[PDB]
Amino acid sequence: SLLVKKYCKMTTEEIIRLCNDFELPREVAYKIVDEYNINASRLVCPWQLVCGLVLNCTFIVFNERRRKDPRIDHFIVSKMCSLMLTSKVDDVIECVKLVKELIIGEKWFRDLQIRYDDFDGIRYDEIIFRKLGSMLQTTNILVTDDQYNIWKKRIEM
DNA sequence: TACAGATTTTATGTTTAGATCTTTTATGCTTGCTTTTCAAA
Numbered sequence: 001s002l003l004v005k006k007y008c009k010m011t012t013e014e015i016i017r018l019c020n021d022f023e024l025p026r027e028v029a030y031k032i033v034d035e036y037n038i039n040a041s042r043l044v045c046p047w048q049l050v051c052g053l054v055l056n057c058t059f060i061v062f063n064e065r066r067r068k069d070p071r072i073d074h075f076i077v078s079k080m081c082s083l084m085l086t087s088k089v090d091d092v093i094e095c096v097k098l099v100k101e102l103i104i105g106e107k108w109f110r111d112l113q114i115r116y117d118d119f120d121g122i123r124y125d126e127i128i129f130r131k132l133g134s135m136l137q138t139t140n141i142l143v144t145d146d147q148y149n150i151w152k153k154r155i156e157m
Numbered sequence: 158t159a160c161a162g163a164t165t166t167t168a169t170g171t172t173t174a175g176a177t178c179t180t181t182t183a184t185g186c187t188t189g190c191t192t193t194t195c196a197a198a
Contacts (some may be wrong), residue, residue: 007196
């Protein structure tokens with residue numbers, strides 16, 4: 001496993017290669033890199049921070065494709081369990097929920113969540129009614145309209 | 158206007174809620190000293 005390794009010498013190009021393995025554009029990848037540099041030391045296992053940062057941005061950037069296909073989540077989790085050479089899927093979840101606590105308040109994470117409309121996996125137009133306690137909020141009980149149209153196309157083909 | 162009755166005035170007692178002030182005791186900072194685990198050789 002790469003999450004047990006302590007005090008590793010990370011070049012600046014390995015993080016860009018790991019970000020390009022998850023199709024992150026240049027701004028978010030450079031922000032992950034800069035987030036690594038300002039906490040370069042004070043670090044125990046760099047791979048845990050980089051892995052949590054990359055997957056935390058991955059669920060934000062690709063949140064449109066994660067609502068349509070729930071398999072994408074397992075798929076990306078497994079690519080990660082791989083690039084970290086680990087067979088335990090709870091270590092990756094521990095990594096992302098430990099990195100989320102260090103990134104939940106910054107300005108750039110705020111800009112990313114605003115621009116891709118992520119807000120812990122929710123649109124703003126739903127989360128304002130979850131926070132208000134609306135009776136008329138959208139319930140995850142009925143199928144999505146576009147998902148139902150996609151299924152109707154799948155049975156038409 | 159006289160008057161019985163009802164209410165007000167003056168006067169005091171009973172009980173609870175809270176304020177203030179003092180005295181003794183907990184506690185938080187200072188500073189110097191000893192032990193201990195964690196980020197490099």
